[PDB]
Amino acid sequence: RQIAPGQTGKIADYNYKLPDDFTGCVIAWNSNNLDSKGNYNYLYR
Amino acid sequence: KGIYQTSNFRVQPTESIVRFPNITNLCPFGEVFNATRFASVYAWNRKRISNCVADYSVLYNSASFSTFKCYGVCPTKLNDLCFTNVYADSFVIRGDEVRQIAPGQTGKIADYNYKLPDDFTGCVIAWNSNNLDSKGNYNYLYRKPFERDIYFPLQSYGFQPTNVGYQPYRVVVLSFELLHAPATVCGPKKSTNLVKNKCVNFNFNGLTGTGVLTESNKKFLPFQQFGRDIADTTDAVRDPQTLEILDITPCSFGGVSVITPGTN
Amino acid sequence: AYTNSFTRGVYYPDKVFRSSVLHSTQDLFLPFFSNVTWFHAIHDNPVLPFNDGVYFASTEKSNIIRGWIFGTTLDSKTQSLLIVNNATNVVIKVCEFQFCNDPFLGVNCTFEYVSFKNLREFVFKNIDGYFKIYSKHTPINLVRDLPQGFSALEPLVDLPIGINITRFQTLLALHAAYYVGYLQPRTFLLKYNENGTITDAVDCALDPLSETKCTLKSFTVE
Amino acid sequence: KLQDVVNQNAQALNTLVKQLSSNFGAISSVLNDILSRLCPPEAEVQIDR
């Protein structure tokens, strides 16, 4: 939900910022069948 | 050939004069967000927060909040912007009913027991309470804007840890008062020294702008804060640390005309 | 028992200084030349409605009037303001007091604040829970009526009480008349002087001369 | 006829200056109060009014 042109947050401000004039598509789906394990390789800043 | 008007001379501001009241007390948000027992929605608490320094960045960086929805402030600038009174509305509701808490929504939480104004200025801060409020927890019941409503119209909840949409959500609604007044709650931004008779970039109590702060004879009354112009721009302010009265003349400007003969 | 309300009920509608400007505003004011109710303290404090704000005055010589009791039921069932001024301090409480049937003074609390010749013109109203006291004292020499003249009213105290008020009552110091205006949504046109003090105001619904003064935004109608 | 030329132009400037105190649908007529209280996705809606 924070991945949108206009949203602010610790995924929006810190590590992955979208332009507010963005042209494109945000395509999201789950990865419960493959990425779920204690899977610790995914980090954020 | 002839006189041609091209641009606008504007004296650029030299420095920035940030000014705030020199109070160092911290605002007790910890008594609100980390309180033990929240009151119910029909008897939501209205805690006045005043005469302190409100670090909203602590409340914005913590990941313990489900939704953090600000309707009129866009909370990045809460540190610079500073208010008079901040009112925290603490109550616990059903999980799906947080969506009805918005300026503009209608519903049996919106119309019946807790109504928001459609011109609301503040932030709706919601998170879950499955670890503490879930038991058959029956103490939470439900029944004009900001109207505490003290066959029956009194209907009670049932909260259990087995219940997502029925989990008890702790929601705190901060209401902001932007009345032009002596401000009390102001965020952690340091005040600088004041420089008179120089084109500076001032900031008094959350009023931005650019002007030449001079001394005045405009005797304000001891409740008056701002002096205004005909065109609603602020003409005179009162320095919130040393209570003197300062004119705001905007910096020297004028049209620039380029007198030329022909380039022929 | 009524009397005339010549020019009274003119307060500073906001905390913003303005000088030498004929600013128009729309707020709850006392209408000019209306009926203010004349009361007694001689040889008298019933329960007065509130409907849309309440003007107050008190021609005083020895500080007889010393208290206010607001609310809706006023018998410790709902919250009740009790502004007490015992000659040295201003004690303001909103507790549910066990009042008497005739409360006076002999010669769940959510807030507490502790600080004829005189006319103590007071204004009391609620704006979305923000109870606002507007007040002004002045030296007068008149025993019978409101003195004809003009003087503006400044604020002292805002109160975020959130109390539903429909009725009230004042208090007395028994061993001094007092007036009850009623505030109405009357547009005024305030005349701020060079010092930012209201020297004149024009009620925009009094007579069709006054609507002409409001439309032109001027006081000298040609 | 000559005082009216002075009056009708001081009237039309003092109507133009008083238009700055109108909200026009926006939340505040002060442009430096929208920029200090709103985020640039939302503030560009208010300033365009």
XYZ file of C-alpha atoms in Angstrom:
580
model
C 0.000 0.000 0.000
C 2.934 2.363 0.567
C 4.094 1.724 -3.031
C 2.149 4.477 -4.786
C 2.952 7.901 -6.221
C 2.001 10.091 -3.287
C 2.397 7.732 -0.334
C 4.876 8.339 2.471
C 6.349 5.683 4.711
C 9.402 3.713 5.724
C 9.296 1.772 2.463
C 8.404 4.925 0.553
C 10.915 7.340 2.082
C 13.748 5.038 3.110
C 14.639 2.478 0.456
C 12.286 2.689 -2.555
C 10.747 6.038 -3.522
C 8.301 6.530 -6.385
C 8.067 9.762 -8.363
C 4.763 11.541 -7.981
C 4.495 11.830 -11.790
C 4.923 8.087 -12.258
C 3.936 6.366 -15.502
C 3.627 2.610 -15.203
C 2.047 -0.239 -13.310
C 2.529 -1.682 -9.825
C 2.077 -5.455 -10.021
C 1.964 -7.326 -6.712
C 1.232 -10.892 -5.620
C 2.094 -13.141 -2.695
C 4.974 -15.595 -2.289
C 3.744 -17.749 0.572
C 4.434 -20.984 -1.292
C 8.086 -20.300 -2.011
C 9.574 -17.454 0.028
C 8.088 -18.482 3.380
C 10.381 -20.808 5.338
C 12.351 -18.245 9.167
C 13.380 -16.692 5.866
C 15.881 -14.009 6.866
C 17.532 -13.139 3.534
C 15.089 -10.262 2.925
C 16.212 -7.077 4.679
C 15.248 -3.400 4.481
C 16.869 -0.060 5.252
C 13.893 50.887 -30.043
C 12.133 51.815 -26.827
C 11.781 50.966 -23.165
C 10.932 47.313 -22.548
C 9.804 45.897 -19.214
C 11.394 42.483 -18.753
C 11.861 41.077 -15.258
C 11.358 41.758 -11.558
C 14.061 42.826 -9.146
C 13.741 40.913 -5.863
C 16.223 41.038 -3.001
C 16.987 37.464 -2.027
C 16.750 36.580 1.679
C 20.036 36.408 3.542
C 19.373 33.823 6.264
C 16.563 31.974 8.023
C 15.246 33.210 11.378
C 13.474 30.241 12.952
C 11.633 31.152 16.135
C 9.657 29.058 18.637
C 8.746 29.335 22.329
C 11.642 28.200 24.512
C 9.803 25.402 26.320
C 11.578 22.076 26.809
C 8.867 19.840 28.276
C 8.101 16.711 26.279
C 4.517 15.921 25.394
C 3.067 12.834 27.137
C 2.198 10.709 24.133
C 3.393 7.676 26.094
C 0.515 8.108 28.519
C -1.843 7.977 25.517
C -0.482 5.358 23.143
C 0.879 3.080 25.884
C -1.945 3.443 28.379
C -3.165 0.312 30.124
C -6.947 0.346 29.627
C -8.519 2.411 26.867
C -12.043 3.680 27.321
C -14.805 2.464 25.037
C -16.126 4.150 21.907
C -19.273 5.568 23.529
C -17.154 7.173 26.273
C -13.949 7.999 24.391
C -11.397 10.041 26.294
C -10.475 13.582 25.281
C -7.028 14.318 26.670
C -5.805 17.879 26.286
C -2.148 18.127 25.279
C -0.678 21.557 25.905
C 2.507 23.454 26.814
C 5.076 20.895 25.694
C 7.183 19.798 22.702
C 5.601 17.169 20.478
C 8.025 14.874 18.660
C 5.713 13.431 16.018
C 8.643 11.676 14.331
C 8.721 9.051 17.080
C 5.060 8.321 16.360
C 5.742 8.214 12.623
C 8.768 5.899 12.679
C 7.357 3.172 14.942
C 6.113 0.130 13.015
C 3.535 -0.792 15.663
C 0.693 1.041 13.875
C -1.672 -0.539 11.368
C -2.841 2.576 9.519
C -1.554 6.125 10.013
C -3.994 8.339 8.133
C -3.678 12.129 8.277
C -6.452 13.975 6.471
C -5.236 17.547 6.462
C -1.613 17.838 7.555
C 0.385 15.254 5.506
C 2.452 14.245 8.513
C 5.988 14.810 7.180
C 5.813 18.482 8.176
C 4.497 17.877 11.709
C 7.908 18.715 13.150
C 8.052 22.211 11.651
C 4.339 23.035 11.876
C 3.213 23.826 15.381
C -0.192 24.160 17.002
C -2.163 25.527 19.937
C -4.012 22.466 21.276
C -3.769 18.794 20.292
C -6.620 16.514 21.356
C -6.165 12.748 21.485
C -9.312 10.644 21.132
C -8.606 7.164 22.527
C -11.096 4.329 22.030
C -11.166 0.667 20.993
C -13.554 -0.684 18.348
C -14.145 -3.663 16.076
C -11.524 -4.320 13.413
C -13.531 -3.430 10.302
C -14.950 -0.238 11.821
C -11.749 1.830 11.506
C -12.669 2.474 7.851
C -15.762 4.372 9.013
C -13.506 6.776 10.968
C -12.877 9.356 8.249
C -14.158 12.840 7.441
C -16.910 11.985 4.991
C -17.829 8.436 5.989
C -21.273 7.478 7.253
C -22.059 4.502 9.437
C -23.140 3.241 12.825
C -19.792 4.228 14.319
C -19.783 7.445 12.309
C -23.360 8.594 12.913
C -24.163 7.047 16.281
C -21.369 7.443 18.817
C -18.295 9.122 17.279
C -18.728 11.641 14.454
C -15.861 13.380 12.667
C -16.166 16.861 11.186
C -15.815 16.948 7.429
C -13.237 19.760 7.750
C -11.072 17.714 10.102
C -7.431 18.616 10.739
C -5.430 15.837 12.339
C -4.406 12.216 12.118
C -6.233 8.921 12.623
C -3.813 6.442 14.201
C -5.001 2.839 14.459
C -3.443 -0.479 15.460
C -4.628 -3.821 16.800
C -4.943 -5.018 20.397
C -5.131 -8.771 19.939
C -2.414 -9.431 22.506
C -4.048 -7.559 25.360
C -7.719 -6.739 24.791
C -8.739 -10.157 23.455
C -9.907 -12.509 26.211
C -14.880 -13.019 25.864
C -13.965 -9.404 26.540
C -17.320 -7.708 27.094
C -16.308 -4.367 28.646
C -16.295 -2.638 25.238
C -19.782 -1.483 24.239
C -21.197 0.856 21.591
C -24.335 2.931 21.112
C -22.988 16.042 16.215
C -19.212 15.776 15.805
C -17.257 15.053 19.012
C -20.411 14.185 20.967
C -19.807 11.774 23.857
C -23.060 9.821 24.192
C -23.133 9.037 27.906
C -35.417 -2.179 23.383
C -32.025 -0.648 24.162
C -29.659 1.248 21.837
C -26.778 0.020 24.043
C -25.020 -2.888 22.317
C -21.876 -4.550 23.663
C -19.035 -6.283 21.851
C -17.497 -9.671 22.391
C -13.722 -9.854 21.965
C -11.825 -13.165 21.867
C -8.392 -14.048 20.435
C -10.119 -16.510 18.088
C -12.053 -13.686 16.392
C -9.131 -10.265 11.868
C -12.211 -8.146 11.194
C -13.471 -8.706 14.746
C -10.151 -8.166 16.523
C -10.194 -5.164 18.894
C -8.294 -2.306 17.270
C -6.815 0.473 19.394
C -7.423 3.694 17.454
C -6.284 7.129 18.641
C -7.517 10.160 16.703
C -5.362 13.256 17.110
C -7.291 16.476 16.534
C -5.339 19.633 15.710
C -6.386 23.199 16.494
C -5.076 25.675 13.917
C -6.655 28.759 15.471
C -4.414 31.816 15.210
C -3.663 32.127 18.898
C -0.791 31.977 21.374
C 0.603 28.593 20.403
C 1.551 26.055 23.051
C 2.358 22.675 21.462
C 5.342 23.108 19.188
C 7.577 20.465 17.673
C 11.287 19.920 18.253
C 12.838 22.594 16.056
C 15.498 24.846 17.532
C 15.004 28.597 17.517
C 17.772 30.859 16.256
C 18.711 34.428 17.048
C 16.595 37.288 15.702
C 18.074 39.749 13.202
C 16.304 43.042 12.515
C 16.492 45.360 9.480
C 17.706 42.590 7.166
C 15.876 40.625 4.471
C 15.502 37.278 6.236
C 13.466 34.111 5.784
C 11.476 34.045 9.008
C 9.392 31.301 10.605
C 7.292 32.344 13.606
C 5.370 29.460 15.226
C 4.649 27.768 11.900
C 4.055 30.916 9.849
C 6.565 30.786 7.009
C 7.444 33.741 4.834
C 10.067 36.238 3.754
C 10.327 39.781 5.030
C 12.311 42.495 6.764
C 11.614 42.327 10.490
C 11.716 45.829 11.945
C 10.621 47.423 15.184
C 7.095 48.781 15.430
C 4.803 50.988 17.474
C 1.816 48.688 16.861
C 0.789 48.125 20.473
C -0.787 44.686 20.426
C -3.125 43.628 23.129
C -1.723 40.870 25.393
C -3.969 38.245 23.763
C -3.155 39.249 20.176
C -0.604 37.306 18.135
C -0.720 38.296 14.448
C -1.321 41.596 12.699
C -2.813 41.273 9.243
C -3.000 43.295 6.062
C -5.979 43.988 3.810
C -5.025 41.019 1.622
C -4.900 38.471 4.513
C -1.079 38.353 4.531
C 0.508 38.828 7.929
C 1.769 42.348 8.507
C 2.992 42.175 12.104
C 3.910 39.349 14.465
C 4.759 39.127 18.138
C 8.081 37.488 18.969
C 7.155 34.393 21.022
C 10.218 34.511 23.300
C 10.771 38.205 24.005
C 7.247 39.581 23.711
C 7.857 42.556 21.450
C 6.048 43.538 18.260
C 7.748 43.212 14.873
C 6.635 44.588 11.533
C 7.000 42.392 8.471
C 7.866 44.465 5.487
C 8.526 42.274 2.430
C 11.944 42.624 0.882
C 12.713 45.384 -1.595
C 11.356 44.726 -5.060
C 10.577 46.565 -8.257
C 10.151 46.223 -11.989
C 13.233 46.133 -14.193
C 12.882 47.956 -17.492
C 15.639 47.813 -20.086
C 15.949 51.071 -22.001
C 17.557 50.299 -25.314
C 17.982 51.688 -28.788
C 17.439 49.211 -31.568
C 19.845 46.350 -32.114
C 19.950 47.643 -35.694
C -38.593 44.157 33.670
C -36.635 45.206 30.580
C -34.343 48.040 29.519
C -32.415 49.161 26.448
C -29.239 47.636 25.032
C -27.885 50.713 23.233
C -24.514 49.760 21.756
C -23.394 46.888 23.970
C -22.284 43.429 22.941
C -19.304 44.317 20.736
C -16.275 42.105 21.284
C -13.048 41.360 19.456
C -14.068 38.322 17.358
C -10.494 36.993 17.038
C -6.961 37.338 18.397
C -5.689 39.139 15.289
C -4.616 42.772 15.411
C -5.982 44.986 12.644
C -5.764 48.769 12.492
C -7.691 51.398 10.497
C -9.877 48.937 8.604
C -13.637 48.404 8.370
C -13.585 44.632 8.716
C -16.831 42.687 8.407
C -17.431 39.534 10.429
C -20.209 36.999 10.946
C -20.418 35.684 14.497
C -22.809 35.457 17.452
C -23.287 39.029 18.682
C -25.773 40.935 20.796
C -28.206 42.800 18.507
C -28.236 46.566 18.919
C -31.033 48.217 20.927
C -32.621 44.898 21.892
C -34.213 43.833 25.192
C -31.821 43.065 28.034
C -33.607 41.871 31.151
C -33.363 43.967 34.317
C -33.054 41.984 37.570
C -32.689 42.613 41.299
C -30.384 42.110 44.255
C -32.281 44.429 46.614
C -34.614 44.094 49.628
C -33.432 36.947 42.627
C -31.518 34.418 40.544
C -33.822 32.128 38.552
C -32.837 29.612 35.888
C -32.336 31.486 32.530
C -32.076 29.756 29.131
C -28.866 29.941 27.133
C -30.142 29.369 23.635
C -27.394 30.885 21.464
C -24.976 32.551 23.845
C -25.610 34.945 26.704
C -24.542 38.538 27.300
C -24.012 39.655 30.869
C -23.596 42.953 32.674
C -23.475 43.938 36.332
C -23.692 47.463 37.708
C -21.594 47.075 40.836
C -20.521 49.051 43.878
C -19.435 46.440 46.455
C -18.903 43.117 44.547
C -22.199 41.432 45.324
C -22.209 39.196 42.242
C -19.487 36.602 42.732
C -20.419 33.352 40.986
C -21.881 31.507 38.021
C -23.504 28.063 37.723
C -24.031 26.631 34.263
C -25.152 23.308 32.862
C -28.437 21.603 32.029
C -29.590 19.924 35.264
C -27.267 21.555 37.836
C -27.665 19.006 40.667
C -24.394 17.038 40.293
C -25.886 14.943 37.473
C -24.023 16.695 34.638
C -20.906 18.842 34.532
C -21.392 22.379 35.819
C -19.110 25.394 35.550
C -18.637 27.284 38.816
C -16.619 30.456 38.294
C -15.833 31.675 41.803
C -14.248 35.078 42.443
C -13.705 35.627 46.176
C -12.057 39.034 45.753
C -8.450 37.810 45.374
C -8.457 34.731 43.096
C -10.435 33.399 40.141
C -11.395 29.788 40.883
C -12.949 28.040 37.890
C -14.197 24.477 38.302
C -16.307 22.130 36.188
C -17.045 19.599 38.920
C -20.480 18.078 39.526
C -21.228 20.074 42.653
C -24.006 19.143 45.040
C -25.648 22.536 44.752
C -28.389 23.792 47.022
C -31.885 24.739 45.894
C -30.730 28.343 46.420
C -26.921 28.342 46.176
C -25.276 31.572 47.293
C -22.328 32.943 49.254
C -22.521 34.295 52.795
C -20.961 37.607 53.785
C -15.821 13.557 38.546
C -13.774 16.722 38.000
C -12.252 17.297 34.562
C -10.773 20.811 34.927
C -9.823 23.354 37.563
C -8.160 26.740 37.172
C -7.036 29.057 39.971
C -5.667 32.532 39.268
C -23.105 52.227 40.796
C -19.486 52.626 39.695
C -18.308 49.489 37.856
C -19.944 47.708 34.927
C -18.537 44.223 34.390
C -19.741 43.415 30.882
C -19.350 39.682 30.319
C -20.063 37.404 27.338
C -20.437 33.625 27.598
C -20.800 31.168 24.723
C -19.833 27.709 23.473
C -18.189 27.095 20.090
C -17.851 23.295 19.594
C -16.852 22.696 23.200
C -14.549 25.734 23.300
C -16.199 27.850 25.989
C -15.036 31.436 25.509
C -15.206 34.183 28.131
C -15.183 37.707 26.703
C -15.113 40.500 29.240
C -14.578 44.199 29.872
C -14.576 46.430 32.943
C -15.123 50.174 32.798
C -15.643 53.076 35.227
C -19.215 54.330 34.915
C -21.355 56.771 36.884
C -24.933 55.540 36.448
C -27.250 53.580 38.729
C -30.273 52.912 36.483
C -29.391 51.774 32.966
C -26.554 50.741 30.695
C -24.501 53.929 30.143
C -24.845 55.216 26.604
C -21.455 55.095 24.958
C -19.199 52.494 23.464
C -16.402 50.205 24.616
C -15.108 46.969 23.118
C -14.733 43.588 24.823
C -11.561 41.488 24.914
C -11.173 37.793 25.751
C -9.703 36.413 28.930
C -10.118 32.626 29.040
C -10.911 29.859 26.576
C -12.301 26.683 28.142
C -12.378 23.340 26.265
C -15.061 21.956 28.541
C -17.345 20.215 26.035
C -20.318 20.784 28.361
C -23.834 20.787 26.980
C -25.399 23.977 28.374
C -29.049 24.970 28.004
C -29.693 26.681 31.368
C -27.691 28.572 33.995
C -27.839 30.779 37.124
C -25.607 33.361 38.772
C -24.630 33.799 42.425
C -24.734 36.563 45.027
C -22.957 37.511 48.260
C -25.787 37.842 50.787
C -25.132 39.876 53.939
C -26.961 45.209 42.247
C -28.865 44.470 39.055
C -27.622 42.204 36.292
C -28.682 41.800 32.684
C -29.252 38.852 30.364
C -28.812 39.553 26.684
C -28.941 36.881 24.025
C -26.410 36.497 21.254
C -27.597 36.099 17.672
C -25.840 35.528 14.322
C -25.635 39.221 13.411
C -23.081 40.351 10.859
C -21.263 43.439 12.077
C -18.909 45.908 10.444
C -16.250 46.735 13.010
C -14.303 49.998 12.934
C -10.765 49.364 14.117
C -8.982 52.620 14.932
C -5.273 53.388 14.548
C -4.671 51.567 17.845
C -6.724 48.543 16.808
C -9.650 49.281 19.135
C -13.283 49.129 18.027
C -14.665 52.663 18.070
C -17.858 51.849 16.152
C -19.905 48.909 14.898
C -22.980 48.618 12.677
C -25.475 45.778 12.980
C -26.208 44.558 9.459
C -29.867 43.766 10.213
C -30.992 46.670 12.424
C -32.637 49.081 9.971
C -32.256 49.574 6.200
C -29.891 52.458 6.858
C -27.566 49.923 8.453
C -27.643 47.449 5.567
C -26.562 50.343 3.361
C -23.621 50.909 5.704
C -22.700 47.234 5.442
C -23.007 46.955 1.661
C -20.847 50.005 0.995
C -18.369 48.949 3.726
C -18.494 52.519 4.993
C -20.115 54.494 7.776
C -20.667 57.797 5.958
C -23.366 56.897 3.441
C -23.524 59.504 0.707
C -16.043 63.990 -13.448
C -12.404 63.965 -12.320
C -12.860 62.716 -8.781
C -14.796 59.812 -10.275
C -11.787 58.846 -12.389
C -9.693 58.670 -9.222
C -12.424 56.855 -7.286
C -13.205 54.217 -9.909
C -9.548 53.180 -10.057
C -8.872 53.135 -6.336
C -12.051 51.068 -6.114
C -10.920 48.559 -8.720
C -7.512 48.148 -7.120
C -8.962 47.751 -3.631
C -11.316 45.133 -4.994
C -8.383 43.351 -6.628
C -6.355 43.361 -3.412
C -9.280 42.048 -1.369
C -9.556 39.053 -3.707
C -6.370 37.712 -2.134
C -8.280 37.031 1.086
C -10.699 34.606 -0.569
C -10.431 30.851 -0.273
C -11.787 30.003 -3.770
C -12.539 26.497 -2.531
C -9.066 25.946 -1.114
C -8.514 25.440 2.593
C -6.724 28.741 3.230
C -6.181 31.962 1.329
C -2.566 32.160 2.531
C -0.374 30.368 0.024
C 2.452 30.013 2.547
C 0.043 28.191 4.870
C -0.772 25.503 2.321
C 2.912 24.876 1.585
C 3.730 24.570 5.286
C 0.752 22.316 6.065
C 0.322 20.004 3.070
C 2.243 17.422 1.097
C 3.183 18.133 -2.564
C 0.779 15.530 -3.985
C -2.101 17.094 -2.059
C -0.912 20.719 -2.043
C -0.983 20.931 -5.841
C -4.731 20.353 -5.688
C -5.258 23.268 -3.308
C -2.895 25.666 -5.077
C -4.565 24.968 -8.428
C -7.778 26.340 -6.931
